[PDB]
Amino acid sequence: SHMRSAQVYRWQIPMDAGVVLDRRLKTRDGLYVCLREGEREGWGEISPLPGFSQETWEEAQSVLLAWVNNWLAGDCELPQMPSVAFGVSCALAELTDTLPQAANYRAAPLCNGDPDDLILKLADMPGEKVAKVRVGLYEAVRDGMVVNLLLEAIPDLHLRLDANRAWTPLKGQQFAKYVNPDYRDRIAFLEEPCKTRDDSRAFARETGIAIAWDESLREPDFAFVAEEGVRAVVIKPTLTGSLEKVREQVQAAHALGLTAVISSSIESSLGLTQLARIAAWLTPDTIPGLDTLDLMQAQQVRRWPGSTLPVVEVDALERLL
Amino acid sequence: SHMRSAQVYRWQIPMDAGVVLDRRLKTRDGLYVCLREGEREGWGEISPLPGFSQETWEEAQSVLLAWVNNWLAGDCELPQMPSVAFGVSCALAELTDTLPQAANYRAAPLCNGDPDDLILKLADMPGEKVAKVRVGLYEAVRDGMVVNLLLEAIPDLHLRLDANRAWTPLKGQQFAKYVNPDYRDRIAFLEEPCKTRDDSRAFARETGIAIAWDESLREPDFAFVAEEGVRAVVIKPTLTGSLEKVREQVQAAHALGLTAVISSSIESSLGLTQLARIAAWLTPDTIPGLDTLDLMQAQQVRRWPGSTLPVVEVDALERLL
Ligand SMILES: O=C(O)CCC(=O)C1=CC=C[C@@H](O)[C@@H]1C(=O)O
Ligand SMILES: O=C(O)CCC(=O)C1=CC=C[C@@H](O)[C@@H]1C(=O)O
Ligand SMILES: [Mg+2]
Numbered sequence: 258s259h260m261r262s263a264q265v266y267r268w269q270i271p272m273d274a275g276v277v278l279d280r281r282l283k284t285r286d287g288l289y290v291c292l293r294e295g296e297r298e299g300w301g302e303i304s305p306l307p308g309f310s311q312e313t314w315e316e317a318q319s320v321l322l323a324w325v326n327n328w329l330a331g332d333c334e335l336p337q338m339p340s341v342a343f344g345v346s347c348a349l350a351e352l353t354d355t356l357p358q359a360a361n362y363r364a365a366p367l368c369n370g371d372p373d374d375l376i377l378k379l380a381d382m383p384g385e386k387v388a389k390v391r392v393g394l395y396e397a398v399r400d401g402m403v404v405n406l407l408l409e410a411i412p413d414l415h416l417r418l419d420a421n422r423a424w425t426p427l428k429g430q431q432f433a434k435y436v437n438p439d440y441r442d443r444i445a446f447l448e449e450p451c452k453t454r455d456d457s458r459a460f461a462r463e464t465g466i467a468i469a470w471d472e473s474l475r476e477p478d479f480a481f482v483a484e485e486g487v488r489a490v491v492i493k494p495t496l497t498g499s500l501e502k503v504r505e506q507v508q509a510a511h512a513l514g515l516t517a518v519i520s521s522s523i524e525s526s527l528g529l530t531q532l533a534r535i536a537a538w539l540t541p542d543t544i545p546g547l548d549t550l551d552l553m554q555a556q557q558v559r560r561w562p563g564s565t566l567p568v569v570e571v572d573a574l575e576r577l578l
Numbered sequence: 579s580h581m582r583s584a585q586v587y588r589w590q591i592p593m594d595a596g597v598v599l600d601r602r603l604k605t606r607d608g609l610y611v612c613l614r615e616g617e618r619e620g621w622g623e624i625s626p627l628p629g630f631s632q633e634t635w636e637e638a639q640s641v642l643l644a645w646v647n648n649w650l651a652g653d654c655e656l657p658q659m660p661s662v663a664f665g666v667s668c669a670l671a672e673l674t675d676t677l678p679q680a681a682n683y684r685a686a687p688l689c690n691g692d693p694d695d696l697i698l699k700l701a702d703m704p705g706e707k708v709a710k711v712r713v714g715l716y717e718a719v720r721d722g723m724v725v726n727l728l729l730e731a732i733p734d735l736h737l738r739l740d741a742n743r744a745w746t747p748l749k750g751q752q753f754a755k756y757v758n759p760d761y762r763d764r765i766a767f768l769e770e771p772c773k774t775r776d777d778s779r780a781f782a783r784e785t786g787i788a789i790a791w792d793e794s795l796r797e798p799d800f801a802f803v804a805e806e807g808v809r810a811v812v813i814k815p816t817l818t819g820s821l822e823k824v825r826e827q828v829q830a831a832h833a834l835g836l837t838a839v840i841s842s843s844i845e846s847s848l849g850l851t852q853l854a855r856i857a858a859w860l861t862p863d864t865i866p867g868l869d870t871l872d873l874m875q876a877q878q879v880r881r882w883p884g885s886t887l888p889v890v891e892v893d894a895l896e897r898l899l
């Protein structure tokens with residue numbers, strides 16, 4: 258039986274109180290697609306992220322439904338709208354059993370709070386110690402002092418930092434000055450230190466601290482480039498597009514000797530598990546940036562193994578078809 | 579002096595009689611941009627190709643002029659229309675002296691006609707013997723017999739072939755059957771043998787004859803993929819987009835162990851010389867597919883070294899600004 262059918266689900270997941278993204282997030286709104294052909298089915302998540310995605314939830318819903326209406330009649334071109342392309346391409350890959358299963362469902366811990374308490378937490382980590390910490394909220398001196406404390410405390414810690422383009426050149430300098438140069442190599446990367454990319458490149462070259470691009474990847478005219486100081490790229494599939502485009506970006510990063518990190522756009526557990534599979538497959542030696550499930554009050558449909566959050570089943574979701 | 583100025587030229591170059599592309603081409607219509615900032619200038623060619631480019635000459639002219647009007651005020655986003663993106667990005671690269679100069683202005687000879695006469699010509703070739711021959715005009719038996727004759731005649735010849743998606747699986751088989759399996763390795767690649775890409779992939783896997791993608795690269799949803807039988811990709815910048823996108827595609831091809839060939843879209847001598855520079859830079863060990871200048875009755879502005887065609891100078895071209 259080659260018979261095609263499909264369902265599209267619309268949903269809202271309550272966020273934990275206080276989730277910040279410069280702006281608060283109360284609810285995660287999104288969509289699932291389920292595609293079926295004969296005995297097989299595949300799922301994907303279409304959840305554009307407010308303030309990051311160009312498209313809204315409602316625009317994505319429209320494009321998704323139109324795409325599904327075509328697919329039901331036979332193969333068609335992928336959507337270009339990135340959230341929809343991501344979710345549909347994932348569902349297609351599951352249908353054909355070409356998105357691999359994974360042993361490991363990994364995430365770099367996203368950490369905040371009292372520095373000493375974090376030291377205690379990170380020292381008890383098994384395996385390679387990688388954690389992600391936001392910078393650029395406090396002043397630069399405080400950030401540099403705290404990073405230095407963490408790195409001095411745990412000799413095998415490697416920190417990913419993210420300034421979300423907060424800094425001027427001077428603030429980047431004030432930060433770096435407080436990080437012991439003998440530890441700077443264990444900043445695995447600092448995402449988007451400065452307001453402009455040229456200022457970020459100068460920060461990297463001048464301080465020796467490795468940077469990564471994140472927001473930059475979605476800007477018009479971005480190109481993958483090997484350049485002194487850039488050590489990594491952060492690929493957020495929901496903001497990027499198809500699974501194949503994601504794969505092309507990982508490949509581009511690796512060809513240039515750059516680390517490619519698969520990272521969360523605050524997807525539901527369904528999309529997060531798929532990101533975990535993408536990471537285990539395409540970036541097997543890079544822990545992905547997926548530690549956002551614990552910002553949410555529930556899982557849906559597909560479980561992240563080990564999570565104790567309650568699970569909303571398919572039958573409780575709103576159906577559009 | 580950081581003062582910006584620009585000129586846009588519109589032109590028509592008469593083609594030699596009988597140039598075929600399933601359809602005749604009388605004239606090559608196109609555009610140049612010249613960008614100047616202080617003491618520096620850069621040039622590029624914007625010449626969409628009828629039947630291949632989505633955009634027309636006139637649509638490209640519009641987009642180019644609008645882009646130039648922005649650039650004159652300061653840096654802006656590149657055009658997305660591929661011919662315009664190519665030409666503008668080339669001009670920008672020249673402005674900053676980031677499109678390298680080249681020693682060699684190379685092209686794989688594009689050959690036709692009596693097989694024996696071609697044998698004589700190719701035997702007198704200095705250096706590595708690579709030539710390109712069209713297939714799929716004659717019947718498949720004739721094509722296979724002639725390819726076999728050429729390869730048997732010249733032991734160090736490597737042929738690039740192009741069927742322009744002419745064949746069914748059966749025609750591909752009729753062709754292959756007449757090529758001695760001991761010589762098939764010296765078909766460097768056969769571009770687009772079959773009407774569908776799946777049929778082309780099966781041709782490659784089943785006959786052992788390497789294929790290349792050309793037209794496929796510009797189709798929606800193309801992805802760069804290592805797969806048995808695909809050995810090369812043909813990148814035509816005018817049909818592709820920016821110099822940076824071209825560079826990304828070469829990089830993608832090389833990461834996958836594929837040959838990347840920079841190829842002509844029947845540009846004027848100006849654009850062809852730039853393609854030659856792109857090839858010497860990005861694909862230093864791959865002779866580019868640039869042997870189309872001798873289809874044209876004149877060069878303009880920039881000379882291909884060694885050509886005896888007359889040169890139309892800048893002062894004879896129509897100016898739009
Ligand atoms: O990359 C990760 O480790 C987790 C995801 C993450 O840090 C982010 C997800 C979405 C928006 C941003 O707040 C933030 C980032 O800039 O990387
Ligand atoms: O690639 C080359 O060697 C020369 C250019 C070439 O063969 C082509 C240019 C433009 C259209 C096509 O006729 C043809 C091709 O399909 O590669
Ligand atoms: Mg980031």
Ligand SMILES: [Mg+2]
Nearest residue numbers: 740769792812
């Ligand atoms: Mg071709």
